[PDB]
Every structure is written in structure tokens, then in C-alpha cells.
Design a protein around this nucleic acid. Structure first.
Ligand SMILES: [Mg+2]
Ligand SMILES: [Mg+2]
Ligand SMILES: [Mg+2]
Ligand SMILES: [Mg+2]
Ligand SMILES: [Mg+2]
Ligand SMILES: [Mg+2]
Ligand SMILES: [Mg+2]
Ligand SMILES: [Mg+2]
Ligand SMILES: [Mg+2]
Ligand SMILES: [Mg+2]
Ligand SMILES: [Mg+2]
Ligand SMILES: [Mg+2]
Ligand SMILES: [Mg+2]
Ligand SMILES: [Mg+2]
Ligand SMILES: [Mg+2]
Ligand SMILES: [Mg+2]
Ligand SMILES: [Mg+2]
Ligand SMILES: [Mg+2]
Ligand SMILES: [Mg+2]
Ligand SMILES: [Mg+2]
Ligand SMILES: [Mg+2]
Ligand SMILES: [Mg+2]
Ligand SMILES: [Mg+2]
Ligand SMILES: [Mg+2]
Ligand SMILES: [Mg+2]
Ligand SMILES: [Mg+2]
Ligand SMILES: [Mg+2]
Ligand SMILES: [Mg+2]
Ligand SMILES: [Mg+2]
Ligand SMILES: [Mg+2]
Ligand SMILES: [Mg+2]
Ligand SMILES: [Mg+2]
Ligand SMILES: [Mg+2]
Ligand SMILES: [Mg+2]
Ligand SMILES: [Mg+2]
Ligand SMILES: [Mg+2]
Ligand SMILES: [Mg+2]
Ligand SMILES: [Mg+2]
Ligand SMILES: [Mg+2]
Ligand SMILES: [Mg+2]
Ligand SMILES: [Mg+2]
Ligand SMILES: [Mg+2]
Ligand SMILES: [Mg+2]
Ligand SMILES: [Mg+2]
Ligand SMILES: [Mg+2]
Ligand SMILES: [Mg+2]
Ligand SMILES: [Mg+2]
Ligand SMILES: [Mg+2]
Ligand SMILES: [Mg+2]
Ligand SMILES: [Mg+2]
Ligand SMILES: [Mg+2]
Lengths: 46, 227, 122, 95
RNA sequence: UCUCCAGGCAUACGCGUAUAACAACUCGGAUAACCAUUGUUAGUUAAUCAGAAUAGGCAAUAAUCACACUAUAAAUCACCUAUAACUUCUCUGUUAACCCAACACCGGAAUGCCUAAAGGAAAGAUCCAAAAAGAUAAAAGGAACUCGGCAAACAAGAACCCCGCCUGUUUACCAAAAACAUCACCUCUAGCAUUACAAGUAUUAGAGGCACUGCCUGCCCAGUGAUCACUUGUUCCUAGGGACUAUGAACGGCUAAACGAGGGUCCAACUGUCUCUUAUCUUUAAUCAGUGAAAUUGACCUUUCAGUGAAGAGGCUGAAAUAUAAUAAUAAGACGAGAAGACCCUAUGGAGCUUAAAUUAUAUAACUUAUCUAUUUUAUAGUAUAAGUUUGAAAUUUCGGUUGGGGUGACC
RNA sequence: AACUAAUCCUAGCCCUAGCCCUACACAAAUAUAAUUAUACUAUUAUAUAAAUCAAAACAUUUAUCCUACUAAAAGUAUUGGAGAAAGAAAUUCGUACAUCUAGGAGCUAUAGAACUAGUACCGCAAGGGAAAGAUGAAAGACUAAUUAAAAGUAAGAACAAGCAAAGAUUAAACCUUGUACCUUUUGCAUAAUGAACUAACUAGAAAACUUCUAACUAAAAGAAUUACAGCUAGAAACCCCGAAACCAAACGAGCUACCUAAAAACAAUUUUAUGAAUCAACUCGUCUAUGUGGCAAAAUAGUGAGAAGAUUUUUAGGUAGAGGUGAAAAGCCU
């Protein structure tokens, strides 16, 4: 079949998989946020 | 995130909604293969301590009335709703139980042998040698754990002092205190083994997934040459 | 493919997603899915009578602006409290216990308008 | 070998050279004969005598041993009662 | 107004102003007109559509028009007892030709209603070439075509071999199958509870094999005198003396049918597959107008023949030919241009897999001695650890050289 | 007689020196699907770094990585498949520019920071990550000029004949001579690689011994060293781009594989009443043609398979790489 359409948007999935609360739930996720803060990213998470 | 569905603390005769596993654990990984889907089923809380005297009552032999013998999705054997006093409780049904029958549950250890009527629960001391029994309990007051499948009967081989030898359905001999409670007769659905599944789809109804498609003595040095 | 930079508002997402736009709550949602508005929770505008009032939006360009002197605790204290204590000290009828006589408030509890923590809006 | 060491930034001696060869100050190197302690029961008497001797090294071997050791091993040592006292110098060498 | 086409309107999810008007005509739409583009201004209005007090007691009786029935896979708060409270409308969603595919992509995309009352336009203009694509028609013949009846047909019928029992499943993007699964049958493991197996218990569960069905073959189960006596057998005590024996493995030929986009074969019919091609229409082509890519490219003022040469020459040697430039066609050459192709060899380059490679191996599982406990007259049992021994779940590392293709033997 | 272009100088940056810091800069909102005014539901880093790599393999081992004053002792003692390599201490020396905020034989728009910006854009996510600007004192003087100047074109197509030139010639072409460049192949090119062209950028680096030039000289050196003409100082040296891999920690199941929960769809026609039959919707993908930078990074057009079930489909959740899932294709996990 034709590929390239693997993104099937869903806001509930997006915020649950990559959101603020998800990232702060684990120390590894908190370190992800710290790295993005040190780089200066405007968007720390979804 | 997996929470077991077995979270009900109070005994009831109301059927309980069961969540299926698929063979996974609380971790979420497969631990047992061949488990998936099937028909949705409801759990009926069985009571395996036949001699449970009712609340606020003395521990003496009592009788119960058989309301109905139902079909159990969760078991090979069939269950019977039995009523006595003001209490209803599900139990395992023997070979010949019918609706409206009366079954005894006795604490008394007969000094002499007690006549064996199928469906009545007596201590193994009361029973005479050779009587078929089912729903045996390893330890007094523990609750039935053995011979509770369809059609399975255990023979009471011997009694000496306060100990009896029970031959389990696998022919493995077990010993227990004669104070332990057993139910006379074999379990119902005596012809459960004669069933024919017939088609692959019927097994998938029962929550069984297909098997995988995937398809050691070491000689000692003296024998290594001669292998 | 999602937009990460735009704000998260109730217009976006599924119907189940809802959130406020910053309006203060005026009531409670009780059981039975019922909204019960509370009269006290609804702000009431205290509007004065403007009849006979001489102050208008603008001022004469010929009106002199004064020297800027922001009000301080000392300035307030001298204007209000100092004369009373000074007069009482000369008469000798002054004691530490009765500072409330001159306007001191030992505690803010029981006041409709508490200075700290503030319990009234602007 | 190590030309520039991490800690001191210097050349390093190959200690396996220092454990097998003697440098005379004139520039010569001494060594033993390989196998002089091996299987003496099957060697001829003349062969054993040849093995026991101390022998000099060639110009290329001397050049290699010079590269593999640092200057400390090339200095004058004034040992009292040195048995090689006379062999640190060359006499009547025209070349 | 006419000609023709036949998935439309809502909701969900998603999207985020693409909605509408005006003004612009730079950019965007693969061209114009016009705007889906730029700028400015506007917009989507809900108490019904949509989103957003406490403690006890307690339940046998599906659904399918639920009646009759049959079934098996066994299948959806309430109600009651007390306690507490004793009149309320704020907040949020609502536009659109829209989403996922780098694109105004012949793709992907759930539900309800309906099938034209809703929604749309295959042709920028012209011309009627070759080749290429698609549709229709065919004199006589009817598989003579071809690896093969592939494709097509005014046909769409019959039959048999091989394989697999069957319906299913699989290599997203070169394999859909004879492979995998499958009921049935067989082997092995396990006598037990509060997170899987399982709120289960040998007619159960797990691991794995294998078509079933019926029919054959028959490893095998000390001898001899008969429930019975001696010789054996096995143990001991010393060749003697005691002690003790107490249906079915391995296999096969096929239920024998049914079924199959499986692999072969045959007959009938049918035909432009072919003898042997043709005509017409559409697409493309070509001319005109607008817009405008790609691989590729040392430089080129870029010929033929014979020789030379690595099987090899537009360019070298010798003869010959030869005003200059376009347009449309052909594919012999430019070892024509592109791919992560094919084959072989090399590296003291990798990686996957398997073991009977070497080194290890508190993964498990056993044990022994300590240690620590209890008891015990030295014994038992146990065990937050240490040291051993046995298993090996795993881990790490390696693939010397000479040997047409190997096999082998050899050799260094 | 000029188009495309070209020219420019400062925005800032680099390395040191010095110096601890104490900046923690309206209201409101935010850990709930962050930035949503109030109760529901409790809250919490990691046991030893590994491997690559060196040992021309690899298996003990392999500086820094993994820091505790400079210089000397000393690359010495010691350690090491005693191999590759590793490597002290005792013991001597050191008041460091001091003062105040300084300095450059450092860069100048392909440089110097990635930076005009962690933005635009790309990715589900972790993450990756750009490009560019130029008038004058005044624009409240109409936005400046400057340059046969790059390739590319135009002004101005071509004229038998040939690596395109050279010798020439009165004469551009005619006549004569002449097998492109680089890299390799055996020193051989009609071989084989590489190059459309222009501009900018784009690859040899160290002092043990040796040589040359000087100071002083049985002594030389500004402490620790060498010395039977030595010793001290100077000068003189050893490239760039490119794998498949390996390990550690994060991020991923919105695709796909399987599972859990809650839901949905299946007309008509026959039937022994169903993993039955015919055939739509729907799911799949047999065969052929087209397409082959396509409409499409797997499609179109026909033709076909299943189509009440081991069916299909929707929403949310789950299992993660030493792993997961697998009706085993070593298939699938953006
Ligand atoms: Mg993609
Ligand atoms: Mg999906
Ligand atoms: Mg198998
Ligand atoms: Mg207009
Ligand atoms: Mg345009
Ligand atoms: Mg519009
Ligand atoms: Mg607009
Ligand atoms: Mg609308
Ligand atoms: Mg695409
Ligand atoms: Mg219409
Ligand atoms: Mg046309
Ligand atoms: Mg026809
Ligand atoms: Mg014909
Ligand atoms: Mg033929
Ligand atoms: Mg033929
Ligand atoms: Mg055909
Ligand atoms: Mg099959
Ligand atoms: Mg099939
Ligand atoms: Mg498939
Ligand atoms: Mg495939
Ligand atoms: Mg098929
Ligand atoms: Mg296929
Ligand atoms: Mg098979
Ligand atoms: Mg088939
Ligand atoms: Mg025929
Ligand atoms: Mg045109
Ligand atoms: Mg020409
Ligand atoms: Mg020519
Ligand atoms: Mg020729
Ligand atoms: Mg020629
Ligand atoms: Mg042509
Ligand atoms: Mg050609
Ligand atoms: Mg080629
Ligand atoms: Mg080699
Ligand atoms: Mg190595
Ligand atoms: Mg190797
Ligand atoms: Mg290696
Ligand atoms: Mg190692
Ligand atoms: Mg820059
Ligand atoms: Mg940059
Ligand atoms: Mg030019
Ligand atoms: Mg010429
Ligand atoms: Mg080649
Ligand atoms: Mg999912
Ligand atoms: Mg139907
Ligand atoms: Mg069917
Ligand atoms: Mg069909
Ligand atoms: Mg069929
Ligand atoms: Mg599957
Ligand atoms: Mg296989
Ligand atoms: Mg294979």
C-alpha cells in the first residue's frame, strides 16, 4: 500500500504521549525538559 | 496501569463482570501464550467451604435447598444455587443434583460410618473407605481445592488414626486429616471429555489463540568416541 | 504535523476537551448536572452618584502639577496618628496597651476588608 | 614507543631494552647470546662457550636501542669498582 | 438557457481562518478569466444541539419484534434504610471549498440519512501524420498463435492427475503457495491459591508434535515339568550356602468425499492469438497561445571505407567523401544514461545464526562447609551472608596458509 | 554604448587577564490534556560507567576520559599477555602585578559563535537545524555611486577539413604539423576512474640522534643537567575526506504485530440452518495491461477472492531494542 500517512492525528494521544504531564512523570522525562530549556527551545513539550 | 478485576471483597450471588488478560501480566508482557479474545463472561462467586455455618448460628449440621443447577462459563463443571436459612450461595454440583433437592452439611465426625448420599458434605472421618468424593481440602477449614473439575471423583483409600489417604484423579495419593471436609459423589458434566470442538472457530470462542508456526543427553568421555 | 507553538484553547481538541477563557466562576455545578448560581459570587458594581460632581476627564493646561511625593508609611503616620499621641503624651494619658485607641488594628481577622491577605478586589 | 607522554610530555624508555642490554658510554651495546641457558645437554662444548660470551651489537641495532632509551641511560656513571671501567672508552680508534 | 456526468447532505475525528466583502494584480494556482494569493474590514449568538452530599443493606432467571420457541459461545445505576441540603443559567464548542499523504495528489479516511429535489463538467484553439495507449466492428478459417489459449471472445461448459483435509493465515513495496494455522489424534510437565496461568484444580493447565477416519503389520512381556515343582535371574555369606522374584513399541497403505484466484492435462465451445491484417472513434501526437521540469554534460569545428589495436576507432595510418542551417521520424553506434543488481577474489573489515570452538558464567536449580538461629544428647532442622561443587539462562571472542569449480586427501 | 552580476564595513564573535556569587526584576495564570480562581487522585536520582580504540588478530592489559599545588628528583624506582604500554614518592623550589577592568604579528558576513535564531523549516518524539545585511552630513535632500571586469547571455547564427591549436601568410577559414587533462595501471593509452562551467573555501603537525650558525670553554647552563672538548642557545620534522560496526543513555506501538476496555456494520436471494451457497456495501489483492521522477517513494484500469464470521471497522489503553510482538514470512515495531 501507499506509505507516508503514518501520522493519524489525535489530540488526546498527542498530549498523553508527549505532553507536559507525561514528561514530568519520570526523571528521564524531566531531564528531557531540562535539555530543551538549556538549548533555549520555545516549545518544551507538546 | 493494569489493575486486576478480582477486587470484590464481599460474597454475593450477583454475577461479576470479568476483565480478560490475553496472557499478559501487570507489567503488560505476554507470560502465557494462546490466550485471547473469546466470548464475554460473567463470574459467579463460588463457595468452596461447603460447611460454612450461617452468621450468628452454631457450628452444627445444617441443610440447604437446591434452587437451580446452572451452566457456568468459567468452569467445566456446572454450578448449583443452594438456599438455606436466609442465605443463598453458589456451589459446585455433583453428578445427579436436581432443583428442589436437599443437601446436608455436617460437622459431626461419625464414630461409625455415615450413609453416603451424593451431594452431602461430611468430614472424611465420617465417610467409610471406598466412597467416591470430590471438592477435597488439603487442610481443615482451608476450602476445596482438589477434584472440583467436571466428572472427577477421588476414592478414599484408607483411614488410620486421624489421617486418611485420598487418591486424587491423577492417581496420585494424598494424605489429609480426617477432620477435612469432602463432598460425596463425582462432579457433574460426567461427559465433558466426550465433547467435540469440531471447528477452529469454536476454540477462538473459548479464548484460545492458535499455536505458533515455529517448528539432549551428553555422552561421557568414555562414550564420546563410541557415540 | 501538529502545531506546537499556538496556544491550547477549548476551540481545539475533541468535544470532551473544555477549559475556561479566564472568566471567574459565578456558581456551583451540583449533582444531577445542575448549575446553581450564587448571588454573592456574582460581582456587584458599586457606582456612585455623579450629580453635582465637578471633576471631568481632563484638566486645564494652566493647572500646575505638583512636586511628586509618593505617600509613605511615615507620611501617613504623621498626618493621622502623631497628633493624637503627641497630645496624649503632653496630658500623660498614653499607654502601650491602648494603641487601638489611636487606630491600630491588632489583627485583620473579623474585618470585612483585610489588608493582608487581601480579601477584596480593586 | 611513546614520544610525548600525557603527564610529562617526554619520551619514554622501552624497559624491555633496559632489561637485556648494557650501554657502554662510547656508544656500544652489550648483550647475551639467545639460548645460552637452553638445552645445554645436547650442545657441543665449543657451542656452549660461544653462547656464554658477552657480545656487541651492530650499528643498526645500536641505533635502534638508542631510540628506544632516553638520555638518562647514556650518561657517565662513576661506580666504585666498576668492572666495565675500561670499556667505556675507545683507544687508538681511527675511522 | 442548452448539452452531458452521477455520491450528495450531516455528524465524529482532524484542521485553525483557508470562511465573507472590499481593494489590489508583486508572490501563490503548475496558464488565463477569476480568485484558493496580498492588504484592510468583518464573522461562529443555545437551560432543549455539544462538552464540563454521606454511610449502610442487596440481586439465580440474556439478546434476537421476546410470544411460541429452540439454543450455546452463556451474554449490562436501580431498589431500600438512615443522615444532610431546602430554589438555579454561569462557563465552553458552533465559520470554511477544511483532514493524513512534501502539492488545489486518479491515494487513505468512521457513522446516520438518502440516490438526485443534492452535487458536478470529460474538450485553451486548431489539425487528423508515424510510433505508442484504449474502445468497437470482421470476409474465409477457428489455437494453425505462444514457453503457455497470455490477452480477447456471440464462449464462461465437461473431465482427470499431483499437492494440501476443509473455511482461514503469511513475506506492507517482486513469492498467497504444496508453507503456516486448523478440528482430531499423540507425547511430555505440574497435586496447587490472593496480579499472569486463575479468583482456575488432572474430564484442569502449560510445553510441543502431528491430517483425521477406518484397515493392516506386531517390538513385546524368565523358562521346564504346570493355584502348583526345578532350572534360571538378582543379591549376599563363603563352588558350597542363605535371601528375593510374584493387550501392545515401531510402522505403513488408504476415510474419499468435499473444497482450491494452488501446479499440470484434456475435450467442447469461443474467438483478430494467429493465417493476415484492416477500418472507425478517443487519448497521445503535430501547429498556435500561456506556463515550464529530469537524468545527463572534459572540451568538440562531433563523417564513410580498409589497416592498426586489448574481440575494440568520429578523432591514429592510408584512401575517399564533403556549401551552410532547421522541422518531423527510426534506434546501428557513442563498451549510450540511471539502481542499494549478478558473478568471483581480497581484508589478521563486520554482522546474524548453530554448536560438540576457546574463555567465563551469585540467570535459574541443586548440594557441602562455615556463619546465624532455634531446639536438641550430641543430634536435628532451618539460613538477609561467605567459600566451594554440580548443572548452564546467557556473555565475550575467533574462523592460519598452499591447494581450476568443488569433493577429498594432503602438504607448511 | 548592457543585462545577469560585482565592489563595501561593522553587526558581532574568539582567546586570555581580572573577578566568586548573592538579579530572585508589575497584576493575573500554570504541574489539570501546564500556563484552566477551590477539595475528587498523593509525592521521591543511581548499586562499579561501558564500548569503540591500541596491542598491527584477540582473550589480562590500553595515557586522557576517571582533576587535587607549579619546576626538579624522572620518564628514575616500580608496574605490565615483563608485550603494547603504564608510572610514583621521599626530597628540594616557588611572596605574582597586587591597583585601579586590561590585552591581541585573533576573525571581519562561505570568516568569527549554529545564531539576524535555537527562530523558519524538518521529525510522532527524543532530536536535527538554516539562510541573509551594506546611500548620504541631511531622504523634513525623490535611495547613492562605483566596475573593458566571473561563468551565462545579448550586441553579432552558420559557410567543404576534422582535440580546434601551432608554423605561418598579403589574407579569419583553405596549406603543413599535431592520438584532450588528471589518476592509475609494468615506465604502455584507442585502457579504466574523476571533472557542465564560474567564484570562494578545501589537505604535513612534533626535535631522540644528526647538520648549519653563534656564546663561553675543561668546563658549559639564570638551582636539580651533561661533560676524557664539551656544553649552551638559535635554525632545521613527520597530511586530508570516507565505512559496515560496537557501547551508554534517552525517544518511539497516532504506522504495523498482538492484546485489553468500550462501541459499531452486514441489503437482497436460496439453504440439510451454517467458519453453507449466490452476490452488493465492505475487506482483501489472483492475473493482465498501463504507469516506471508516475495521479502514486506501490497507483490506475480491468479481471478476480471472502463477504454472520478464526469477519470487518472505530475510539482509548498496553507490551520497547541485551527488547517487544509473530496462525514462523527470521515477518512486523513511523
Ligand atoms: Mg513520513
Ligand atoms: Mg488508526
Ligand atoms: Mg508446527
Ligand atoms: Mg475583486
Ligand atoms: Mg501563474
Ligand atoms: Mg473564498
Ligand atoms: Mg484573502
Ligand atoms: Mg457549519
Ligand atoms: Mg507523496
Ligand atoms: Mg445539480
Ligand atoms: Mg483536446
Ligand atoms: Mg469484439
Ligand atoms: Mg473474422
Ligand atoms: Mg501449437
Ligand atoms: Mg509455431
Ligand atoms: Mg485469459
Ligand atoms: Mg489449504
Ligand atoms: Mg481458502
Ligand atoms: Mg496481506
Ligand atoms: Mg510482497
Ligand atoms: Mg490465493
Ligand atoms: Mg503477489
Ligand atoms: Mg504445513
Ligand atoms: Mg489456492
Ligand atoms: Mg477445440
Ligand atoms: Mg506553447
Ligand atoms: Mg557546424
Ligand atoms: Mg561538421
Ligand atoms: Mg576501422
Ligand atoms: Mg581520421
Ligand atoms: Mg531528430
Ligand atoms: Mg543507437
Ligand atoms: Mg553504460
Ligand atoms: Mg595479512
Ligand atoms: Mg587490536
Ligand atoms: Mg578481524
Ligand atoms: Mg574486532
Ligand atoms: Mg576487551
Ligand atoms: Mg556566519
Ligand atoms: Mg552558519
Ligand atoms: Mg562576461
Ligand atoms: Mg583545417
Ligand atoms: Mg571496473
Ligand atoms: Mg494502537
Ligand atoms: Mg445479510
Ligand atoms: Mg461462507
Ligand atoms: Mg464469491
Ligand atoms: Mg467460494
Ligand atoms: Mg496475525
Ligand atoms: Mg520458514
Ligand atoms: Mg528461510
Amino acid at each position: 500500500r501507499a506509505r507516508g500517512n503514518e501520522y493519524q492525528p489525535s489530540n488526546i494521544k498527542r498530549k498523553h504521549k508527549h505532553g507536559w504531564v507525561r514528561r514530568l512523570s519520570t526523571p528521564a522525562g524531566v531531564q528531557v525538559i531540562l535539555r530543551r530549556m538549556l538549548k533555549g527551545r520555545k516549545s518544551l513539550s507538546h | 496501569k493494569f489493575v486486576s478485576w478480582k477486587s470484590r471483597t464481599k460474597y454475593t450471588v450477583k454475577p461479576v463482570k470479568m476483565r480478560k488478560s490475553g496472557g499478559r501480566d501487570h507489567t503488560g508482557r505476554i507470560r502465557v501464550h494462546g490466550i485471547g479474545g473469546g466470548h464475554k463472561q460473567n463470574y459467579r462467586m463460588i463457595d468452596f467451604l461447603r460447611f460454612r455455618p450461617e452468621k450468628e448460628k452454631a457450628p452444627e449440621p445444617f441443610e440447604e435447598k437446591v434452587v437451580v443447577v446452572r451452566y457456568d462459563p468459567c468452569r467445566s463443571a456446572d454450578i448449583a444455587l443452594v438456599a438455606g436459612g436466609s442465605r443463598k450461595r453458589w456451589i459446585i454440583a455433583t453428578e445427579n443434583m436436581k432443583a428442589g433437592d436437599t443437601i446436608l452439611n455436617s460437622n459431626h465426625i461419625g464414630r461409625m460410618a455415615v450413609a453416603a448420599q451424593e451431594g452431602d458434605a461430611h468430614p472424611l472421618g465420617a465417610l467409610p473407605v471406598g466412597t467416591l468424593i470430590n471438592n477435597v481440602e488439603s487442610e481443615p477449614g482451608r476450602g476445596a481445592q482438589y477434584i472440583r473439575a467436571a466428572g472427577t471423583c477421588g476414592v478414599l483409600l484408607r483411614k488410620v488414626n486421624g489421617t486418611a489417604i485420598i487418591q486424587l484423579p491423577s492417581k496420585r495419593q494424598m494424605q489429609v486429616l480426617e477432620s477435612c471436609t469432602a463432598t460425596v459423589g463425582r462432579v457433574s458434566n460426567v461427559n465433558h471429555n466426550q465433547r467435540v470442538i469440531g471447528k477452529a472457530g469454536r476454540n477462538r470462542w473459548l479464548g484460545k489463540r492458535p499455536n505458533s508456526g515455529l517448528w539432549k543427553i551428553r555422552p561421557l568421555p568414555p562414550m564420546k568416541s563410541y557415540v | 504535523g501538529a502545531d506546537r507553538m499556538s496556544k491550547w484553547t477549548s476551540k481545539r481538541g475533541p468535544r470532551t476537551f473544555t477549559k475556561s477563557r479566564g472568566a471567574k466562576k459565578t456558581g456551583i455545578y451540583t449533582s444531577d448536572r445542575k448549575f446553581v448560581q450564587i448571588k454573592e459570587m456574582v460581582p456587584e458594581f458599586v457606582v456612585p452618584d455623579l450629580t453635582g460632581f465637578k471633576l471631568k476627564p481632563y484638566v486645564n493646561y494652566r493647572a500646575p502639577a505638583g512636586i511628586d511625593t509618593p505617600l509613605t508609611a511615615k507620611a501617613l503616620f504623621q498626618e493621622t496618628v502623631a497628633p493624637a499621641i503627641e497630645k496624649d503624651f503632653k496630658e500623660g494619658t498614653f499607654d502601650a496597651n491602648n494603641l487601638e485607641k489611636y487606630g491600630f488594628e491588632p489583627t485583620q481577622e473579623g474585618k470585612l476588608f483585610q489588608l493582608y491577605p487581601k480579601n477584596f478586589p480593586r | 614507543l611513546t614520544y610525548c607522554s600525557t603527564r610529562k610530555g617526554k619520551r619514554k624508555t622501552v624497559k624491555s631494552v633496559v632489561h637485556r642490554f648494557l650501554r657502554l658510554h662510547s656508544g656500544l651495546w652489550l648483550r647475551r647470546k639467545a639460548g645460552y641457558k637452553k638445552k645445554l645437554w645436547k650442545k657441543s662444548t665449543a657451542r656452549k662457550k660461544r653462547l656464554r660470551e658477552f657480545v656487541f651489537c651492530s650499528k643498526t641495532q645500536s641505533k635502534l636501542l638508542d631510540k628506544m632509551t632516553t638520555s638518562f641511560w647514556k650518561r657517565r656513571n662513576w661506580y666504585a669498582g666498576d668492572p666495565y671501567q675500561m670499556y667505556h672508552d675507545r683507544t687508538n680508534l681511527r675511522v
